[PDB]
Scaffold this active site. Structure first.
Site, PDB file in Angstrom:
ATOM      1  N   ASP A  25      49.835   2.643 -32.338  1.00  0.00           N
ATOM      2  CA  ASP A  25      50.573   1.391 -32.366  1.00  0.00           C
ATOM      3  C   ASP A  25      50.105   0.410 -33.446  1.00  0.00           C
ATOM      4  O   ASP A  25      49.197  -0.360 -33.210  1.00  0.00           O
ATOM      5  CB  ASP A  25      50.452   0.760 -30.960  1.00  0.00           C
ATOM      6  CG  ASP A  25      51.437  -0.388 -30.724  1.00  0.00           C
ATOM      7  OD1 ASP A  25      51.949  -1.002 -31.696  1.00  0.00           O
ATOM      8  OD2 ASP A  25      51.686  -0.672 -29.532  1.00  0.00           O
ATOM      9  N   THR A  26      50.823   0.346 -34.550  1.00  0.00           N
ATOM     10  CA  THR A  26      50.472  -0.529 -35.639  1.00  0.00           C
ATOM     11  C   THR A  26      50.756  -2.015 -35.338  1.00  0.00           C
ATOM     12  O   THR A  26      50.210  -2.915 -36.000  1.00  0.00           O
ATOM     13  CB  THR A  26      51.221  -0.140 -36.932  1.00  0.00           C
ATOM     14  OG1 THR A  26      52.634  -0.273 -36.743  1.00  0.00           O
ATOM     15  CG2 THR A  26      50.930   1.291 -37.350  1.00  0.00           C
ATOM     16  N   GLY A  27      51.566  -2.302 -34.332  1.00  0.00           N
ATOM     17  CA  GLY A  27      51.818  -3.673 -34.012  1.00  0.00           C
ATOM     18  C   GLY A  27      50.724  -4.249 -33.109  1.00  0.00           C
ATOM     19  O   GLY A  27      50.631  -5.467 -32.910  1.00  0.00           O
TER      20      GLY A  27
HETATM   21  O1  LIG Z   1      54.281  -5.819 -25.636  1.00  0.00           O
HETATM   22  C1  LIG Z   1      54.092  -5.110 -26.664  1.00  0.00           C
HETATM   23  N1  LIG Z   1      55.021  -4.200 -26.990  1.00  0.00           N
HETATM   24  C2  LIG Z   1      56.285  -4.192 -26.341  1.00  0.00           C
HETATM   25  C3  LIG Z   1      57.564  -3.865 -27.092  1.00  0.00           C
HETATM   26  C4  LIG Z   1      58.385  -2.762 -26.713  1.00  0.00           C
HETATM   27  C5  LIG Z   1      59.584  -2.542 -27.404  1.00  0.00           C
HETATM   28  C6  LIG Z   1      59.999  -3.370 -28.449  1.00  0.00           C
HETATM   29  C7  LIG Z   1      59.202  -4.448 -28.848  1.00  0.00           C
HETATM   30  C8  LIG Z   1      57.984  -4.712 -28.175  1.00  0.00           C
HETATM   31  C9  LIG Z   1      54.716  -2.902 -27.624  1.00  0.00           C
HETATM   32  C10 LIG Z   1      53.518  -2.318 -26.945  1.00  0.00           C
HETATM   33  O2  LIG Z   1      53.546  -1.948 -25.527  1.00  0.00           O
HETATM   34  C11 LIG Z   1      54.339  -1.064 -24.986  1.00  0.00           C
HETATM   35  C12 LIG Z   1      54.745  -1.198 -23.622  1.00  0.00           C
HETATM   36  C13 LIG Z   1      55.587  -0.205 -23.055  1.00  0.00           C
HETATM   37  C14 LIG Z   1      56.024   0.901 -23.849  1.00  0.00           C
HETATM   38  C15 LIG Z   1      55.639   1.027 -25.206  1.00  0.00           C
HETATM   39  C16 LIG Z   1      54.795   0.048 -25.766  1.00  0.00           C
HETATM   40  C17 LIG Z   1      54.365  -3.081 -29.170  1.00  0.00           C
HETATM   41  O3  LIG Z   1      54.261  -1.828 -29.720  1.00  0.00           O
HETATM   42  C18 LIG Z   1      52.996  -3.779 -29.419  1.00  0.00           C
HETATM   43  O4  LIG Z   1      52.792  -3.777 -30.785  1.00  0.00           O
HETATM   44  C19 LIG Z   1      52.917  -5.254 -28.935  1.00  0.00           C
HETATM   45  C20 LIG Z   1      54.155  -6.062 -29.445  1.00  0.00           C
HETATM   46  O5  LIG Z   1      54.081  -7.537 -29.405  1.00  0.00           O
HETATM   47  C21 LIG Z   1      53.153  -8.273 -30.094  1.00  0.00           C
HETATM   48  C22 LIG Z   1      52.714  -9.495 -29.600  1.00  0.00           C
HETATM   49  C23 LIG Z   1      51.748 -10.284 -30.319  1.00  0.00           C
HETATM   50  C24 LIG Z   1      51.234  -9.825 -31.557  1.00  0.00           C
HETATM   51  C25 LIG Z   1      51.686  -8.578 -32.043  1.00  0.00           C
HETATM   52  C26 LIG Z   1      52.633  -7.813 -31.310  1.00  0.00           C
HETATM   53  N2  LIG Z   1      52.920  -5.295 -27.438  1.00  0.00           N
HETATM   54  C27 LIG Z   1      51.850  -6.157 -26.885  1.00  0.00           C
HETATM   55  C28 LIG Z   1      50.451  -5.776 -27.202  1.00  0.00           C
HETATM   56  C29 LIG Z   1      49.579  -6.702 -27.763  1.00  0.00           C
HETATM   57  C30 LIG Z   1      48.272  -6.333 -28.088  1.00  0.00           C
HETATM   58  C31 LIG Z   1      47.818  -5.023 -27.862  1.00  0.00           C
HETATM   59  C32 LIG Z   1      48.699  -4.119 -27.302  1.00  0.00           C
HETATM   60  C33 LIG Z   1      50.023  -4.510 -26.972  1.00  0.00           C
END
Ligand SMILES: O=C1N(Cc2ccccc2)[C@H](COc2ccccc2)[C@H](O)[C@@H](O)[C@@H](COc2ccccc2)N1Cc1ccccc1
Lengths: 99, 99
Positions: A25-27
């Site tokens: 997960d790069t985000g």
């Molecule tokens: O909630 C999320 N989402 C949810 C999501 C799902 C679909 C479309 C868009 C977003 C997934 C991650 O979680 C899931 C949950 C269920 C299924 C798949 C992924 C992203 O991929 C993460 O990148 C990050 C996205 O949001 C942010 C918020 C603040 C700063 C940066 C990004 N996290 C939160 C997070 C924060 C820190 C560590 C791990 C996860």
């Protein structure tokens, strides 16, 4: 490996001697895994995202093996819906985004 | 380009004549932008994040340029903390993860 994103980039990780499935997960700034017990002292932390915040336990200096490349870093443990490998460990295995 | 992960993978996108910053997020199935006005009709959609579910509005066939690459596809608008480019659009620009 060169990973396409037609599907979720799930990989196997070895942690605590256990094998688990996780998403690259790069985000995500941090790595967050579902409830498990690791040895060590831990600190409470709140991490938030889509949907709000969750409380996790932060463990430092944990060893993980991602697709065979060892990496060391902080790992957050809590009620996450999927195991997530964030930037703090992807940088250690040399993972980049390319287009 | 090749993007490393020591910093958040933020890029400029152009949507509706305006420039915004967004995160390339391989963990997100879909693309979710902060509140904005888009043209057309929208449909309802629920997305699961780390802290739970959020209801967003779905617009189809929206033109968005990402780092100079023009993509046309589905964009969701909702209360997200950051603009997020997900796999549905990362695949249109030819993005892969490499290590
Ligand atoms: O909630 C999320 N989402 C949810 C999501 C799902 C679909 C479309 C868009 C977003 C997934 C991650 O979680 C899931 C949950 C269920 C299924 C798949 C992924 C992203 O991929 C993460 O990148 C990050 C996205 O949001 C942010 C918020 C603040 C700063 C940066 C990004 N996290 C939160 C997070 C924060 C820190 C560590 C791990 C996860």
């Amino acid at each position: 490996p060169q990973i396409t994103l037609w599907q979720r980039p799930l990989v196997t990780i070895k942690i605590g001697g256990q094998l688990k499935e996780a998403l690259l997960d790069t985000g995500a700034d941090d790595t967050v895994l579902e409830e498990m017990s690791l040895p060590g002292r831990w600190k409470p932390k709140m991490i938030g995202g889509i949907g709000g915040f969750i409380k996790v336990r932060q463990y430092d200096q944990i060893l993980i093996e991602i697709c065979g490349h060892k990496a060391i870093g902080t790992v957050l443990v809590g009620p996450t819906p999927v195991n997530i490998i964030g930037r703090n460990l992807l940088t250690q295995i040399g993972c980049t985004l390319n287009f």
